[PDB]
Design a protein around this nucleic acid. Structure first.
Ligand SMILES: [Zn+2]
Lengths: 193, 56, 50, 115, 102, 123
RNA sequence: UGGAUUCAACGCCGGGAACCUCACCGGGGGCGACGGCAGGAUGAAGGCCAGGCUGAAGGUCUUGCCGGACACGCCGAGAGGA
RNA sequence: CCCCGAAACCCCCGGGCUACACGCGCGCUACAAUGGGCGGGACAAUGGGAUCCGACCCCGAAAGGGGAAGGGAAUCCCCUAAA
C-alpha cells in the first residue's frame, strides 16, 4: 500500500458512502458525512437536517444502516452518530433537495423557488441563484433562473465561497434539474475598506 | 424440470470485461492509474469530492 | 417429477432393498443399473460392475 | 514421396508428440508445449476412435485453432466458419497447420459499381 | 541512543505544519534533539480526462490534480517522547509512520 | 400410505393434529421420517412404535399387504385427513403422505398416552 | 452493429475491438418478483452417475440414480433491456 | 413515453466489427549528399513501479530465457535518449 493509494481509497470509499446516503436520506436533508478511524472502531458522523428521519423508529434506521456500512463497505466497526447543519439555509444541496421534494409534492415552481429564495435571504445570505431546467410549462423544455442578492460565478472565490447544490426532481412526466448557488456573508478581494 | 443452470458468470482476469466502473458499471474507458477503477465520466463528476483540483 | 419411487420390497417383518451399493462410498448410497455399471446418487462418479 | 522433414508419414505416426513438435514451426510447437484445451482433447479422442471404431458420425467442431497432426489424416473434419460446418479432407501436406486456414469465413468480394 | 524517523504526509500544509509544530514544541518542552521537518518532493497525481461524453465537438481536457505534501522528522527515541508523540492528535487527513533507526 | 376407502377407525381432530403439534417440537430433538418408502422402512425395521398417515398417495402401493401385516409388531397408524393439515402440522411447507415417528419427543407421558388412545381405537 | 458530415464529422465517441468489450451474424442454453390458475412433495422443487444427440454440454433423453422438498404447464403483473 | 418482455432480458461457442474494383480526411516513411551505412564518442527531462519495477550474474546471434539484490518511491529500477 502506497500513500497516494491510501488517499485515493479513502476518498473513493467515502464518495460511495455519500452516494448511498444521498439516495436513502434525501428526505432528511443529508448534507454530508465525516469519518474517523478511532482505535476502538470507525466512527462516522452524518450531518443532516432531520436526524429524526435518519434514526426513524428508535434507532431502527441507524441500525440497518450500520449493518450496510460494515458489510457493503470495508469498515472496521461503524459507530454512526448524527448532527445538524448549523445553517442549512446557507447550505445549498439541502435546499436544492427540499425544492425538488416540493416540486414532487406538486407545488408550482415559481412559488417554491421564490419561497426558498425569501427564506435564504432572510436567513442571511448575500446572494442566491436558482436554476430550474426541464419540462416546465408544457412539453418543450426551458430553463428559468430566479435570483436575488449578489452572486459571483467565475474565479477561485466562486469555487471556494459560494455553495453549489444540485438535485433532480423526478416528476410524472420527467426530470426537473435544480441548481442552487448561495453566497453567504463573507467578503471578496476588491472590497478594500 | 431436472436440468442444470447455465448463466456462467465467467471470471475474466484481463480485458475490458475484466474491468468495470465501481459506480455506473461501464466496461471501457476506465481509470486505473493509482488504484482507481472509474469511468472517465464519473471521475470528472466526482474528482473534487476525492480531493482532485483543477489548478493548471 | 418422476414422482413415485417406492423401491423396497417388504419381505415380511423387514424390507429388502431394490438398490445396489457402491463399495468406495459410504452407507445408504443407492445405485442404478446401466447394462454394465452402477450410478451414485449422492455425488456421482465413475464405476462399473466388474 | 511426401517426406515432411526427411520423415515419411509412417515415421510421423510412430513418432511421439514431443519430436513431431520439434519438427514443427515455432508457433505450433508453442501451442502443443502449452497444451491442448478440453475441446481439443475431446475432438482428438473422437478422431482416435474414428481411425479405430467408427465414431458412428462425422466429426464436427468449432475449434479452428487445433493444429493438424499425422493422426488427423485420412479423415474429414467439418469446421465451423461462423455459419456452416465446412468439410476439410485432410491430406499429408496440411500436417502442421490449423483447421481454420481451410475453413474460411469471408467470401471473396465481387464489387458493384460505386454509388 | 537510537533515532526515530517520522514520515508524515497530507493534502493540507496547515495540518502538516500543525503536527510539526506539535513535535517541535514537545521536543523543546523536553530537550531531545530534533532534525527539522525535511520537506520531501510533493507528489502530483495528474489525471487528464476528456471533459466530453459525446465524443463530438472539439476535444477539451480536464487536468485534475491531487497534491501530497510530505515531511520527515528525525527525533531521538525516548520512551517519554515516543509515548507523547503517540498521544498526538494526528488529524484525519494525514498519515504518519514512525520508523526507528537503531 | 392411506386411501379414502382405507379409513378403518375414528380419529379425533384434536387427538391426531395435537399429537402432531407435540412431535413438532420433537423433530428438533430427533429424526422423523416421511413418505411411504421411509414409513415402510421404519415399520419394517422396527425402530418406530406408531405412525400417522394421510389419504393422498397415488396409486395403491402397500394396502394389498398392509391389512395382514400391520399386526406383525403391534404398531398403530393414526389417520390425518389430508396433505393440507399434514404439511401444516409437520412444520415444513410441502407435505407428505405419511409421518413415520422415530425418537418421539415432549415426553412419552403425552405421546404414547395418545398411543394408549389408539390402544382404545385400533392398531 | 451504431453515432457524428462545413467551420464545430472523418487517430472523434478516450473507439490501440483475437474472447469479453458488442450493441451485428450463425448456433446453443437460462430468466415471471408478487398474486392467482393446472396441480402438489406420493419424494421431489433443484442438482444429478455412463452414454446418444450436441461444436461441447445433466440441455435433453430409453435405461435407471437420491440429498429431503412447491407451482409459466396458464394469466395478469413484472426484473432487466448498449 | 413507446416497445420487448420468455424475448428486443442474461450467459456460452464460433464468426464479424480487421472484409476492398474505388472516393475523402489526418498522419508515418520517403523520393537522398542540407545524405545512407559501419565503427567509435557525447549530453536530458517529465512521469511510472506489487504479482509490479527489476539492477547484478549466467545462457543465447537476435528476439528472448533462468536465477535474482534492492525497491510500496528524493534511497532501488524503468534510465548512459535521439537529433
Ligand atoms: Zn462510472
Amino acid at each position: 500500500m502506497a500513500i497516494e493509494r491510501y488517499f485515493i481509497e479513502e476518498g473513493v470509499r467515502e464518495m460511495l458512502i455519500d452516494e448511498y446516503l444521498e439516495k436513502e436520506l434525501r428526505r432528511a436533508g443529508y448534507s454530508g458525512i465525516d469519518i474517523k478511524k478511532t482505535p476502538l472502531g470507525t466512527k462516522v458522523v452524518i450531518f443532516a437536517a432531520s436526524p429524526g428521519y435518519v434514526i426513524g423508529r428508535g434507532g431502527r434506521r441507524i441500525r440497518e444502516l450500520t449493518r450496510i456500512l460494515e458489510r457493503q463497505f470495508g469498515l472496521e466497526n461503524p459507530q454512526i452518530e448524527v448532527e445538524e447543519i448549523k445553517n442549512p439555509y446557507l447550505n445549498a444541496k439541502v435546499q436544492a433537495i427540499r425544492l425538488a421534494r416540493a416540486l414532487e409534492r406538486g407545488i408550482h415552481f415559481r412559488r417554491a423557488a421564490y419561497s426558498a429564495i425569501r427564506a435564504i435571504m432572510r436567513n442571511g445570505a448575500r446572494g442566491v441563484e436558482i436554476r430550474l431546467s426541464g419540462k416546465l410549462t408544457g412539453e418543450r423544455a426551458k430553463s428559468v433562473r430566479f435570483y436575488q442578492g449578489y452572486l459571483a460565478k467565475v474565479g477561485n472565490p466562486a469555487e471556494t465561497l459560494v455553495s453549489r447544490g444540485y438535485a433532480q426532481a423526478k416528476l410524472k412526466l420527467g426530470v426537473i434539474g435544480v441548481k442552487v448557488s448561495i453566497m453567504p456573508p463573507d467578503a471578496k478581494l476588491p472590497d478594500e475598506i | 424440470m431436472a436440468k442444470a443452470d447455465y448463466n456462467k458468470r465467467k471470471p475474466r482476469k484481463f480485458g475490458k470485461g475484466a474491468r468495470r466502473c465501481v459506480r455506473c458499471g461501464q466496461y471501457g474507458p476506465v481509470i486505473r492509474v493509482h488504484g482507481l477503477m472509474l469511468c472517465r465520466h464519473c471521475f470528472r463528476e466526482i474528482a473534487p469530492k476525492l480531493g482532485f483540483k483543477k489548478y493548471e | 417429477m418422476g414422482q413415485k419411487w417406492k423401491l423396497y420390497e417388504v419381505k415380511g417383518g423387514k424390507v429388502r432393498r431394490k438398490n445396489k451399493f457402491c463399495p468406495r462410498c459410504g452407507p445408504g448410497v443407492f445405485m442404478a443399473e446401466h447394462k454394465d455399471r452402477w450410478s451414485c446418487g449422492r455425488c456421482g462418479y465413475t464405476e462399473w460392475k466388474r | 514421396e511426401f517426406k515432411y522433414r526427411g520423415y515419411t508419414f509412417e515415421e510421423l505416426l510412430n513418432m511421439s508428440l514431443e519430436d513431431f513438435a520439434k519438427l514443427l514451426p515455432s508457433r505450433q510447437r508453442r501451442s502443443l508445449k502449452r497444451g491442448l484445451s478440453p475441446e481439443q482433447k475431446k475432438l482428438l479422442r473422437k478422431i482416435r476412435l474414428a481411425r479405430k471404431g467408427k465414431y458412428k458420425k462425422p466429426i464436427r467442431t468449432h475449434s479452428r485453432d487445433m493444429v493438424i497432426l499425422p493422426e488427423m489424416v485420412g479423415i474429414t473434419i467439418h469446421v465451423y466458419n461462423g455459419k456452416e460446418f465446412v468439410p476439410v479432407e485432410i491430406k499429408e501436406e496440411m500436417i502442421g497447420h490449423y483447421l481454420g486456414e481451410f475453413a474460411l469465413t469471408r467470401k471473396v468480394v465481387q464489387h458493384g459499381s460505386p454509388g | 541512543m537510537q533515532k526515530a524517523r517520522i514520515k508524515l504526509a497530507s493534502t493540507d500544509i496547515k495540518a502538516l505544519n500543525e503536527v510539526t509544530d506539535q513535535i517541535r514544541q514537545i521536543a523543546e518542552r523536553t530537550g531531545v534533539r530534533m532534525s527539522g521537518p525535511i520537506p520531501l518532493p510533493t507528489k502530483r497525481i495528474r489525471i487528464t480526462t476528456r471533459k466530453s461524453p459525446d465524443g463530438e465537438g472539439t476535444a477539451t481536457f480536464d487536468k485534475f490534480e491531487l497534491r501530497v505534501h510530505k515531511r520527515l522528522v528525525d527525533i531521538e527515541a525516548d520512551e517519554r517522547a515516543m509515548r507523547q508523540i503517540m498521544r498526538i492528535r494526528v488529524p484525519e487527513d494525514v498519515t504518519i509512520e514512525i520508523e526507528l533507526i537503531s | 400410505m392411506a386411501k379414502p376407502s382405507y379409513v378403518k377407525f375414528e380419529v379425533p381432530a384434536e387427538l391426531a393434529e395435537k399429537a402432531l403439534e407435540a412431535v413438532e417440537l420433537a423433530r428438533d430433538t430427533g429424526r422423523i421420517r416421511k413418505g411411504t418408502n421411509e414409513t415402510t422402512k421404519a415399520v419394517e425395521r422396527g425402530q418406530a412404535k406408531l405412525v400417522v398417515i394421510a389419504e393422498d398417495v397415488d396409486p395403491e402401493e402397500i394396502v394389498a399387504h398392509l391389512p395382514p401385516l400391520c399386526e406383525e409388531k403391534e404398531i398403530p397408524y393414526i389417520y390425518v385427513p389430508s396433505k393440507k393439515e399434514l404439511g401444516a402440522a409437520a412444520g415444513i411447507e410441502v407435505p407428505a403422505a405419511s409421518v413415520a415417528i422415530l425418537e418421539p419427543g415432549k415426553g412419552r407421558e403425552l405421546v404414547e398416552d395418545i398411543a394408549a388412545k389408539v390402544r382404545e381405537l385400533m392398531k
